[PDB]
Each structure stands twice: as structure tokens, then as C-alpha cells.
Ligand binder design. Structure first.
Ligand SMILES: Cn1cc(C(=O)NCCCNC(=O)c2ccc(F)cc2)ccc1=O
Length: 116
């Protein structure tokens, strides 16, 4: 509270670490459904069903222009990608399984990097 400050993390490396984690996502072989925005003029239903579309290139753009205030909001956008994926696709479809794979890949790197 006012004039009662907490021991805080050292966040000076966060931007560089989030960029490295996103680079590993972008280069994973199962990243192909997520590299670019879902083509709303070519995918029937997506616009109406998915309230907040999100993809790796939009996340990369936001990270390179200072639009994430903290690493918590960055993880929100990453998880948003895979939440959208689960909502719209079958778990055992190709896109659906890629999303499960990529989510597990992300959460391991998140813990390995920031829960040390
Ligand atoms: C997450 N999600 C993705 C799609 C979807 O149709 N995505 C198109 C991928 C095109 N296929 C590629 O291989 C590719 C894409 C970009 C790139 F830079 C290189 C290759 C549909 C429903 C859904 O829920």
C-alpha cells in the first residue's frame, strides 16, 4: 500500500527474454496455424465466434513497439492464441493438436525462464 513497497523482481531482462521465448515459438514446426492472423474473409465463422483474435506476428509487433506493460500481459496474449484455438478447433484436428502442443511448449519455457 501507500509507502509500503514490496520486494520486487528484477524486470530489466524481461523484454529480451520474452522476445527469445517468442522466437522459439515462431520457429517450432507446429507454429504454422499461429504465425499470421486468421484470414477473416476466408475462414467461415471466425469473425463472429472469436472475440479477440491473436497471433504470433501481432504479439511480435506489440512487443517491438512497447505495447506490453509487463511480462504478465505478454503471457496473456500468448495464452489467448491457444484459448482461441481450443474454442474453434477439435482437440484431434491438426490445428487443434498443434495448439495443445504449442501451449505445452510455451508453459515449459515460461517456467524454466521465470520460475528459477
Ligand atoms: C488458429 N487457426 C488457424 C486457421 C488457418 O486457416 N491458418 C492458415 C495457415 C496457412 N498455412 C501455412 O502453412 C502458413 C501460414 C503462415 C505462414 F507465414 C506460412 C505458412 C484456421 C482456424 C484457426 O483456429
Amino acid at each position: 500500500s501507500m509507502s509500503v513497497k514490496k520486494p520486487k523482481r528484477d524486470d530489466s531482462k524481461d523484454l529480451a527474454l520474452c522476445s527469445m521465448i517468442l522466437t522459439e515459438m515462431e520457429t517450432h514446426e507446429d507454429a504454422w496455424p499461429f504465425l499470421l492472423p486468421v484470414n477473416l474473409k476466408l475462414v467461415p465463422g471466425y469473425k463472429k465466434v472469436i472475440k479477440k483474435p491473436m497471433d504470433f506476428s501481432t504479439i511480435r509487433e506489440k512487443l517491438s513497439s512497447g505495447q506490453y506493460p509487463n511480462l504478465e500481459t505478454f503471457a496473456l496474449d500468448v495464452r489467448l492464441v491457444f484459448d482461441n484455438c481450443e474454442t474453434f478447433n477439435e482437440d484431434d484436428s491438426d490445428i487443434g493438436r498443434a495448439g495443445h502442443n504449442m501451449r505445452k511448449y510455451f508453459e515449459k519455457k515460461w517456467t524454466d525462464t521465470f520460475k528459477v
